[PDB]
Design a protein around this ligand. Structure first.
Ligand code: HEM
Ligand code: HEM
Lengths: 727, 727
């Protein structure tokens, strides 16, 4: 009709803007100048809308899209209404099966570039030149929950990267923890069935806190390593931008000379490692189930591009057997103290999709999608994965032509003799659909392996053994890695691990399962087991107290790289601060607060007891972003309360609870002038306490102190003080 | 190996037990003696497991289900491992498209029986005889969210009942509010797209609190009536057991003499009407996203069978045009003050399914599945619905033979000339697959319509009009029903509606959309409009303040049946109380508490600061159901704190916060003896306060007070006191 407002406020500016400043929008409209080879190649399927007539799918203009065709205006709908029927039919068939695992996921476009040529160790084209840019499409995910499940659950996170290289698609399909729960792919359905919603009633969603998961864990000790990671704060990341990424399996790099080097893939978050605390994460699944999806999208819209450093742990063929653990066992990590991560390149995620369904939901990643210069190994979990993705994608994406779905298409040439299949888009003109052929002079033709642009040839690994359904004896060690992980965590991280196990085991209805898990923990570490046991009202037996701890891992009694927080790596850019306003805010405090945050790329959200505007002490009109209940402290990293008429909000339950919640979840809180009246709400001494910034105004060192706390992420020293506190 | 505990505590007793007393289980194992004709008919496909060997799907016994076949124990997996491939293939193809709408749902089996023969007004066989029982399968659902989204969201709820009648399946596919948002089915995709997650980023899940929903509502005033219901506490039911159900459309009843009677279907919850409060509901989506699913299942295992009374609003054919609203307009309700609901029958849900996916996920309901004695009307929303379910089920359930999926099969005979189609189960022996045929003597044959067991014949409604895509002018009234609903709510219900709109609209990023919705509210009721406007910092214009209120609906200024709470209908059976234990609980208090609770069929959950057991003062060993954090006050209806060693939990932050949350959410709290010291935490009253039961001990009078409060559901009088509490 012409329903947009005349000021054009319905449309977001096509420029980087902080979270909440403008309505979010499709990537190509929000950042039309952000391009890459893949993004450009999707132009052929992008469809606009402005200034076009509304039509059926056959191109017939529709005159009345408000009504069905009927006999009389109060009459029965007629079967000849082909417009109604096409519109309802398309609607009716909108859904496709969600992914069997990792159904819940958020994705974005970006680019990768290596720091230097890696031609000495791999002939992979995308790693051969620092000036060679490779477009990427990355999807981050949870594992257990459906596509409509919540983001901030306790779960492993998926981190899949589709590299659109010049010699083929390479998919690096990893997780946020360096090991997996099981050793052999044949047990994948068992493990996944155990963690997913139980079959009689389909509960619980997005949670491993139920009997079947812990039943399986209790009977399969190989799972303990990854379970330790899931129970730690690693299982509840702050953002996809602040978690590590790992390929898990040992793969191979193959150079032009034919030499194979073992490699484990790593992604280092350039924004640092950061996680939530359980109570916050759990409550956040309720207040904002799309928190991570939203955070990713808004970071990219703000220009806070998620950046990750690709790194390789490289192990020479001759050192295959030099560790206490098997390199092919996916339940074992390779300690960075033993084998350092060599920095390979940077990946920048800088554009959101246009349509979530088309690009995100239909994206298909496969660990078997490798390119010349990479190869597999006999890791028995990897081995089975190679079969699985291929197979699942035929039903999820409706046929064998899912590579023709725009997001999945290679940007490089693809030609072969494969034909037909449902939804076939490519119209082949080749006279031949077989090889060898003479009728097209055998094209397209095979290409011999070579240093560059050659055909794929598998590394000639020697195979010797009998056909057996047997686990290698080298994989039969289940407690040393869990123990190495435990010992590398800080004391507060250890507490969070104990708390994760205790909470989860409390949701296990059959007590003997709890006892059985406690017994497994006693094979890992007595302190851990005792602390969890105490929380479950379980007493360890004398035999359990005497279980000898498992050996160190190749002489290591700890590796600080396994901790989220042992080694400071805090980055404040992209974080957000809640600013609790009052009806006569000290404008000078606001100026100082907002400019200091802006200088470090920290966002702010101005909150009040209602929407609309508040007028500062000098007449400054302040637009309110959200109410205290509307945007809870769960969604921010810190809280600042400026001076002004504090009596306006002093007796406001939400405003007080805002601070109690933020205080409980170890977030920095800064109170200026009369906002110090709020100290009694959170029980802060007159003298003050580490983690609380306070002063007469927000002028001198006030913001620098607050930003130092934000750099350290959370105030871990406050843990004992939050023990009481009714919040 | 991995075997059950020696004591047999791995298996739930096959008798009715209170929630939490036993692990939940498939229905046929929990209640083997509970049967009905449909439940029995599913015996052909039920598969047991105990004492059977593990096999492939082809019946080959598996020797080693822990490993893949490889060449050497550290070698590559072989392609000939057919056991692994079948296992992984089946896993890879587990998912099927979720429902386009109402993907999140919970279902159970039961039975229905009419109170008296309704043969005078309908020839429908299932309503012909009071002693003729009809098996039912019911699915309750949310609408917007995916299958893995949370239960306690603010949304409409679906209430679909499949009646397995002797003359065919009859599906009564309704909702928990008596009207729908839109008028014509042609706009269903528009409305559903507006409320679903926005297309660029697929946010938000299970929420209408986003720009596109309010944008559509603001431009389509026909939606306002159902929006009012959604924003009220109707949008967040406490249980599927405590909400009303409605067919929404006017349908027809056809008796044996051919007389048509207009009818609107109702379901009255025999457990009464009860809803959560927003803060509680939202937080509960985080603490237990499966709350409603769990609550339904546990009520059924406990013997608290959900019971509903089928009721009919009957309007003679001659009275079609006597109201000031059109009967065929699905955005209009028929006030009970004008047309009473006649009680028709009782439906009892007494058994959970065995496998959620097979029975719930694959269940297919259709408003078009009617039987002789029923007929449609020209309601344009209903008309389009007849097309849509059939169509969507062909892709969701993979073919045209979805009626052969066990849960969907009729229990009556079904014979016809339809053949083939994907996954055809029925093997037809008829020599003929067409009619008329002489080769099978024309069987199966058509059956003339008649009083009983006749063929279906449409009521011969007179149709007169031109082929038009036009909305009836009689449907063009959008504010009188919203206003009637508003005026029928209690003052606290009105406040909750205001708060619902205020919350939702604060999440709308484009301010003009908020203003447009406020403008629409001003056409309904100025008090409502002003209350919302004030929360959004919006000022009504002089024109808006002068908008004339819509007329009353046929002289009604209110109708108390539209309120959840105006007319008391409280029923405590099946409700649950949290009991906050201490390490030296007064057994005399527990005795009196449980006795009183037991008499009213109210359950209890014993909570503590740790799991395991606590021993009362008399040596009674009490198993702990959950910790204070583990089962928040959100999950219960009231909280009781017995006396004993109160010092044990007096300074416990979670225990204090438990009471503050329950207090804020208007739940009855009862404190005995030294537990009265907890009154300080909820900063309120000295003498006493209505809603807080207190005494020197938990006695008969103490429990009578608490149970009386529980029968009123929540302590509405405490509302003014909760906005200061920091919780
Ligand atoms: C190291 C262990 C594993 C890792 C790191 C891993 C990682 C992932 C990730 C990140 C995704 C989602 C990709 C996306 O965002 O679309 C995924 C999906 C999937 N995974 Fe794996 N996974 C592992 C083990 C396995 C195993 C053992 C199997 C079966 C043999 C398996 C089968 C699947 C399937 C069927 C999907 C769905 C793919 C689709 O529908 O496109 N995964 N996995
Ligand atoms: C009075 C208005 C409506 C009511 C009360 C209603 C009710 C329901 C319910 C309760 C379900 C879920 C059934 C289950 O539990 O499986 C459902 C599903 C569905 N509804 Fe309706 N609906 C309405 C309007 C419409 C309209 C106008 C259309 C399309 C023209 C439509 C299309 C669908 C579809 C396609 C499904 C999915 C069915 C399946 O996949 O089996 N609905 N509806």
């Amino acid at each position: 009709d012409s329903l947009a407002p005349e000021d054009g406020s319905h449309r977001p500016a096509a420029e980087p803007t902080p979270p909440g400043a403008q309505p979010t929008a499709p990537g190509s409209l929000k950042a039309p100048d952000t391009r890459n080879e893949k993004l450009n190649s999707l132009e052929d399927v992008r469809k606009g809308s402005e200034n076009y007539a509304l039509t059926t799918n056959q191109g017939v203009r529709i005159a009345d899209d408000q009504n069905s065709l009927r006999a009389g205006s109060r009459g029965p709908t007629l079967l000849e209404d082909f417009i109604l029927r096409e519109k309802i039919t398309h609607f009716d068939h909108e859904r496709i099966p969600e992914r069997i695992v990792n159904a819940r996921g958020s994705a974005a476009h970006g680019y990768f570039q290596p720091y230097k040529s890696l031609s000495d160790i791999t002939k992979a084209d995308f790693l051969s030149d620092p000036n060679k840019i490779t477009p990427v499409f990355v999807r981050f995910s949870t594992v257990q929950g459906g596509a409509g499940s919540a983001d901030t659950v306790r779960d492993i996170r998926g981190f899949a990267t589709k590299f659109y290289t010049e010699e083929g698609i390479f998919d690096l399909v990893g997780n946020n923890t360096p090991i997996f729960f099981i050793q052999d792919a044949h047990k994948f359905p068992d493990f996944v069935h155990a963690v997913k919603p139980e079959p009689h009633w389909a509960i619980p969603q997005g949670q491993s806190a139920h009997d079947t998961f812990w039943d399986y864990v209790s009977l399969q000790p190989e799972t303990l390593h990854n379970v330790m990671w899931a129970m730690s704060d690693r299982g509840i990341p702050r953002s996809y931008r602040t978690m590590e990424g790992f390929g898990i399996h040992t793969f191979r790099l193959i150079n032009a000379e034919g030499k194979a080097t073992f490699v484990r893939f790593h992604w280092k978050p350039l924004a640092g490692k950061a996680s939530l605390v359980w109570d916050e994460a759990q409550k956040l699944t309720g207040r904002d189930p799309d928190f991570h999806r939203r955070e990713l999208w808004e970071a990219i819209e703000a220009g806070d591009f998620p950046e990750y450093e690709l790194g390789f742990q490289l192990i020479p063929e001759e050192d295959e057997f030099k560790f206490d653990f098997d390199l092919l066992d996916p339940t074992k990590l390779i300690p960075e103290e033993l084998v350092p991560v060599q920095r390979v390149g940077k990946m920048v995620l800088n554009r959101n999709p246009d349509n979530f369904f088309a690009e995100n939901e239909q994206a298909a990643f496969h660990p078997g999608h490798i390119v010349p210069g990479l190869d597999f190994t006999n890791d028995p979990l990897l081995q089975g994965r190679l079969f699985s993705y291929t197979d699942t994608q035929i039903s999820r994406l409706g046929g064998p032509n899912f590579h023709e779905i725009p997001i999945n298409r290679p940007t490089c040439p693809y030609h072969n003799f494969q034909r037909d299949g449902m939804h076939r888009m490519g119209i082949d003109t080749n006279p031949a659909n077989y090889e060898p052929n003479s009728i097209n002079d055998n094209w397209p033709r095979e290409t011999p392996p070579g240093p560059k642009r050659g055909g794929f040839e598998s590394y000639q690994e020697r195979v010797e053994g009998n056909k057996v359904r047997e686990r290698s004896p080298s994989f039969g060690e289940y407690y040393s890695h869990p123990r190495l992980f435990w010992l590398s965590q800080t004391p507060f991280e250890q507490r969070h691990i104990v708390d994760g196990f205790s909470f989860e085991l409390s949701k296990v209805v059959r007590p003997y399962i709890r006892e059985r898990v406690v017994d497994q923990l006693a094979h890992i570490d007595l302190t851990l087991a005792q602390a969890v046991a105490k929380n479950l009202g379980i007493e360890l037996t004398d035999d359990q107290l005497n279980i000898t701890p498992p050996p160190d891992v190749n002489g290591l009694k700890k590796d600080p790289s396994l901790s989220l927080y042992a080694i400071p790596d805090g980055d404040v850019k992209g974080r957000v601060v809640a600013i609790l306003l009052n009806d006569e805010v000290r404008s000078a405090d606001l100026l100082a607060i907002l400019k200091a945050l802006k200088a470090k790329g920290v966002h702010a959200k101005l909150l009040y007891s209602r929407m609309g505007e508040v007028t500062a002490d000098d007449g400054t009109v302040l637009p309110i972003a959200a109410t205290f209940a509307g945007a809870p402290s769960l969604t921010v990293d810190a809280v600042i309360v400026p001076c002004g008429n504090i009596a306006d909000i002093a007796d406001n339950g939400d405003a007080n609870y805002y601070l109690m919640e933020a205080y409980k979840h170890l977030k920095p809180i800064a109170l200026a002038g009369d906002a110090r009246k709020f100290k009694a709400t959170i029980k802060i001494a007159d003298q003050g306490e580490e983690g609380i910034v306070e002063a007469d105004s927000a002028d001198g060192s006030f913001m620098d102190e607050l930003l130092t706390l934000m750099a350290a992420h959370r105030v871990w020293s406050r843990i004992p003080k939050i023990d009481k506190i009714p919040a």
